[PDB]
């Protein structure tokens with residue numbers, strides 16, 4: 264296993280360093296809050312005295328930060344020592360800001376590989392976990408084996424915005440579902456039910472979603488938005504029932520209103536008798 | 551096999567009447583649009599000439615209509631024939647609208663059992679299908695074997711609104727995730743990707759949800775919103791990345807703005823360093 268530097272020891276960076284040490288990588292770590300490296304150092308990781316010494320320790324520099332602005336904040340001061348470094352940035356951001364980070368790293372002699380990890384910290388090091396990757400192909404292939412300690416690698420192409428784009432595509436569904444979980448837990452709590460009580464039914468419900476994803480994928484892709492499978496107005500009534508159920512129980516209705524508002528836009532566009540999938544045509548229009 | 555009356559012959563009512571005839575129940579049917587009964591009548595079902603005749607024909611009256619307002623419009627003129635009847639209303643509506651329906655049936659001498667069927671019409675009669683049930687237990691247990699012809703019976707309690715409550719709790723996450731899928735498709739299409747291209751990742755994202763449902767269940771229930779797995783402020787950045795990725799790609803931001811606003815309410819209320827799950831405290835009914 265090759266040596267490498269890991270900068271950023273939040274929940275994902277910690278899980279990353281432990282998986283790299285489990286594999287035997289010679290690991291050099293640095294974190295703004297130095298306290299968070301103590302456990303990794305006790306396992307054998309090398310604590311870098313500064314962020315510049317961390318970058319200087321290895322060719323491979325893995326970042327796990329909040330966004331790409333944090334990369335400039337951490338790497339900016341010693342940016343003149345980034346020449347010849349491979350920076351694998353595993354931080355979420357937009358495709359545009361991901362490309363800007365790649366341009367900035369190139370200006371200073373390094374090369375950036377963009378990554379999007381699709382697993383929680385407990386999934387790091389597990390072969391069922393995956394991460395999108397995009398950036399220079401030669402630099403990626405050269406360090407793929409090291410990156411495969413963390414997750415399976417899904418290389419998407421040269422453009423760094425690709426891995427970020429694929430990450431956001433899955434994350435918009437993920438956050439939508441998880442906030443709906445909190446909304447369902449909030450409704451349950453208003454009626455004397457715990458998250459543990461609704462957990463089996465909530466799990467059963469989302470576990471059946473892939474069949475609907477497959478059913479509607481090919482319908483959306485051929486432009487088949489006919490109301491033969493479902494009628495949008497019937498979905499409006501369904502989401503109106505959710506909203507008013509929430510309101511009757513005194514639970515917040517900000518997100519249920521937003522969902523109802525989109526169905527109302529669907530009906531305002533004349534899609535009442537078409538499938539609810541027709542709202543993808545509204546969602547494609549800007550603003 | 552006990553005889554019963556079925557009113558409401560949409561796709562759900564059709565599958566129900568067929569399942570009842572399959573098992574051998576004597577079936578009296580009525581629908582506002584009489585021609586919808588043609589196939590069931592040719593199978594052996596008895597066509598009632600009027601809704602009043604339908605209600606008078608049997609003690610058990612199963613309803614598969616749009617909502618509870620449709621029950622008042624339909625059963626109103628016949629409200630006197632309701633004395634001694636057990637009305638099993640399988641129409642989806644809010645818990646409060648269901649409870650008002652149960653009081654209105656009681657005012658006219660009947661008893662309402664509320665059902666929440668969690669399967670499409672093709673699931674009616676199949677062994678793994680299920681439906682929540684609520685209402686007076688004795689009247690339910692007297693007709694439980696007949697109802698078990700349609701789905702598994704999941705009795706939830708005496709309060710008539712409980713079946714609707716459990717139905718709405720599951721639908722919250724379903725519509726949130728499916729609308730998030732449409733958002734992901736729109737973003738994908740704006741960047742040259744079809745729904746078929748993102749279907750595997752969207753299925754992986756959805757299928758991994760039960761892990762997070764179980765992970766945050768007891769943490770929410772015990773009030774443990776520690777940031778050991780995630781910080782809310784990191785989630786705020788993540789959903790802002792989605793929002794601005796949508797804007798950068800010229801697609802709609804209505805739902806992403808609503809998601810960002812909730813995270814910012816979490817930060818505004820002092821939860822920036824807690825898990826994102828702590829936003830359930832903002833969604834919960836007051837005091």
Ligand SMILES: NC(=O)C1=CN([C@@H]2O[C@H](COP(=O)(O)OP(=O)(O)OC[C@H]3O[C@@H](n4cnc5c(N)ncnc54)[C@H](OP(=O)(O)O)[C@@H]3O)[C@@H](O)[C@H]2O)C=CC1
Pocket residue numbers: 271272273274275276294295296299327328329330332333336337353354355356380381382383384779780781784788
């Ligand atoms: N948490 C999860 O389950 C998942 C998150 N991700 C993504 O992975 C990334 C890592 O997130 P996560 O591990 O949760 O942790 P956080 O984003 O909460 O923090 C990660 C690290 O960023 C550092 N940091 C943030 N801002 C600055 C700054 N201005 N200057 C210096 N250091 C800074 C923190 O330093 P310090 O320790 O000093 O605070 C910390 O070590 C995010 O972009 C996230 O979207 C992807 C997969 C899943």
Ligand SMILES: NC(=O)C1=CN([C@@H]2O[C@H](COP(=O)(O)OP(=O)(O)OC[C@H]3O[C@@H](n4cnc5c(N)ncnc54)[C@H](OP(=O)(O)O)[C@@H]3O)[C@@H](O)[C@H]2O)C=CC1
Pocket residue numbers: 557558559560561562563581582583586614615616617619620623624640641642643667668669670671
């Ligand atoms: N996938 C599904 O279909 C599922 C449906 N459900 C719930 O089951 C219920 C019925 O389902 P489904 O058959 O699909 O619904 P439909 O809306 O297709 O059927 C509505 C039925 O109610 C009748 N009706 C509506 N309004 C009135 C009125 N004002 N007066 C008299 N009759 C009226 C219609 O009669 P007419 O024929 O004359 O129009 C028809 O028989 C709904 O509440 C639905 O949400 C539950 C889960 C799954």
Ligand SMILES: Fc1ccc(F)c(C2=NCCC2)c1
Pocket residue numbers: 380381382383437779780784785788826
């Ligand atoms: F921002 C967050 C917060 C909590 C999380 F579990 C995540 C994850 N990304 C992929 C699923 C886990 C991201």
